[PDB]
Design a protein around this ligand. Structure first.
Ligand code: NI
Length: 341
């Protein structure tokens, strides 16, 4: 059965709720982004209306074979009417095609559902600036002060400088980057760009990337692995065994691998700066775990909510334990007392 925090009161709508069969009284199903915990349940046999971004719609049609007649893409930053209710889709600064959804209820209540997001001060100047929000359905993934990580720009600087140094010292080094879903494409695109290479990958992953409207993409990616010195592999294969085996397949073209695992947060964050990050090394293989996050840090999340001043917050992540819920509720009260709303 569909949980309460995926239902929007006073509407026919649910958010990210495709794994519960036919939801009682749901007339339209919204999908914030194409990540499997959120899309779980969609396929060619789905015959209710799905509302989403253009990019999410490309992925529904091409990757899951949802029929075109049930896909309703909306433009961003544009007031739209859906089953008699005004909505707006806003950029979530998560993975490509990810949105937040503003709902303008017929009784006058305004609700923001963030989906998954990385809060940013640029959001303080979207269509959010222009009215009060009563209820916030919040991505609370890292809602605890231990969760600090650097900006995405500092992390990309580290990666480009690391890769460029390694390959300049040894022109026979291969760079590998791990992936398992959409998101974090800047990691492998920035490295390929500094090295003057395209990124090589499987046909299935190339197809996924062609759905994303990334400009000049035919220029940066390829399925010809032989012509590429930046390769993408499944995240599961980013270990010494998996990488040793890959290196065998390259036929003596290469004699060293430098690999990157973008993670979210890891506890090496609490003690070490990005500048100071070091790899795990075995023989001719080095693996860097780099803290490239597509979710809000605690301080980014706090700043957003203190700016927005919602009357009620409904967490959508970490809701399964009493200890987690209690912790999050205590931070929301601090934030409200400190800011005066
Ligand atoms: Ni996500």
């Amino acid at each position: 059965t569909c949980p309460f925090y995926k239902k929007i009161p006073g509407t026919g709508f649910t958010v990210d709720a495709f794994q519960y069969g036919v939801v009682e009284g749901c007339t339209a199903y919204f999908l914030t982004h194409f990540h499997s915990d959120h899309y779980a349940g969609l396929s060619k046999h789905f015959t209710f209306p799905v509302y989403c971004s253009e990019i999410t719609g490309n992925l529904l049609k091409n990757k899951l074979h949802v029929q075109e007649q049930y896909i309703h893409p909306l433009p961003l930053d544009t007031e739209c009417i859906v089953n008699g209710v005004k909505v707006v889709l806003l950029d979530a600064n998560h993975c490509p095609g990810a949105v937040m959804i503003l709902f303008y209820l017929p009784n006058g209540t305004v609700i923001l559902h963030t989906g998954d997001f990385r809060a940013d001060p640029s959001m303080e100047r979207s269509l959010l600036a222009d009215q009060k929000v009563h209820m916030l359905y919040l991505d609370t993934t890292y809602c605890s002060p231990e969760y600090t990580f650097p900006s995405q720009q500092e992390v990309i600087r580290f990666a480009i400088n690391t890769a460029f140094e390694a390959v300049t010292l040894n022109p026979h080094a291969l760079v590998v980057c791990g992936t398992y879903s959409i998101g974090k494409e800047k990691v492998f695109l920035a490295i390929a760009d500094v090295l003057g290479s395209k990124v090589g990958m499987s046909q299935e992953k190339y197809k996924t990337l062609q759905c994303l409207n990334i400009p000049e993409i035919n220029s940066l990616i390829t399925t010809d692995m032989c012509s590429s010195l930046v390769h993408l592999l499944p995240m599961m294969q980013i270990n010494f065994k998996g990488l040793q085996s890959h290196l065998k397949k390259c036929g003596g073209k290469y004699n060293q691998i430098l690999a990157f695992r973008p993670t979210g947060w890891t506890h090496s964050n609490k003690f070490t700066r990005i500048a100071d990050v070091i790899p795990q090394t075995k023989g001719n293989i080095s693996i860097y775990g780099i803290p490239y996050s597509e979710h809000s840090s605690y301080l980014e999340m706090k700043r957003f909510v203190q700016w927005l001043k919602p009357q009620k917050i409904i967490p959508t992540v970490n809701v399964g334990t009493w200890k987690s819920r209690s912790t999050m509720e205590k931070y929301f009260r601090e934030w409200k007392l400190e800011a005066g709303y």
